[PDB]
Amino acid sequence: FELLHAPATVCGPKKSTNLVKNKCVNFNFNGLTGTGVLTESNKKFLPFQ
Amino acid sequence: ALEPLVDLPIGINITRFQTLLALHAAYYVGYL
Numbered sequence: 001f002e003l004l005h006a007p008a009t010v011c012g013p014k015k016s017t018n019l020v021k022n023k024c025v026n027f028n029f030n031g032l033t034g035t036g037v038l039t040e041s042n043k044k045f046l047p048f049q
Numbered sequence: 050a051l052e053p054l055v056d057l058p059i060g061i062n063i064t065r066f067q068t069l070l071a072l073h074a075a076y077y078v079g080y081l
C-alpha cells in the first residue's frame with residue numbers, strides 16, 4: 001500500500017458526509033483523521049498538492 | 050522552480066536516454 005500526502009486513488013468503502021464549516025468537527029480526508037474548525041482559505045495550493 | 054507533471058510506476062532499470070527532433074534551437078543536459 002502506498003502511503004503519501006499525494007492524491008489518493010484507492011480507498012476503503014467509507015461513505016462521504018457533507019462538508020461543515022466555521023464549526024469544530026472531527027474530520028477525515030482520505031484517511032487523514034483529525035479535529036478542528038474547517039474554513040475556506042486564501043492559500044492557493046499548486047494543482048499537484 | 051519546476052512543478053511536477055507526471056509519475057510512472059513503470060519499473061524500468063534505466064541507464065541511457067536521448068532527445069527527439071522534428072523536421073520535414075538548442076538543448077542542454079545535466080545530472081542529479
Ligand SMILES: *[C@@H]1O[C@H](CO)[C@@H](O[C@H]2O[C@H](CO)[C@@H](O)[C@H](O)[C@H]2NC(C)=O)[C@H](O)[C@H]1NC(C)=O
Nearest residue numbers: 057058059060061062063064065066067080081
Ligand atoms: C540494472 O540493469 C543493469 C544493466 O542495464 C544491470 O547491470 C549493471 O550492474 C551490475 C551490478 O552487479 C554489473 O554487474 C553490470 O556490469 C552492469 N552493467 C552495465 C551495462 O552497466 C544491473 O545489475 C541492474 N540492477 C540490478 C539491481 O540488478
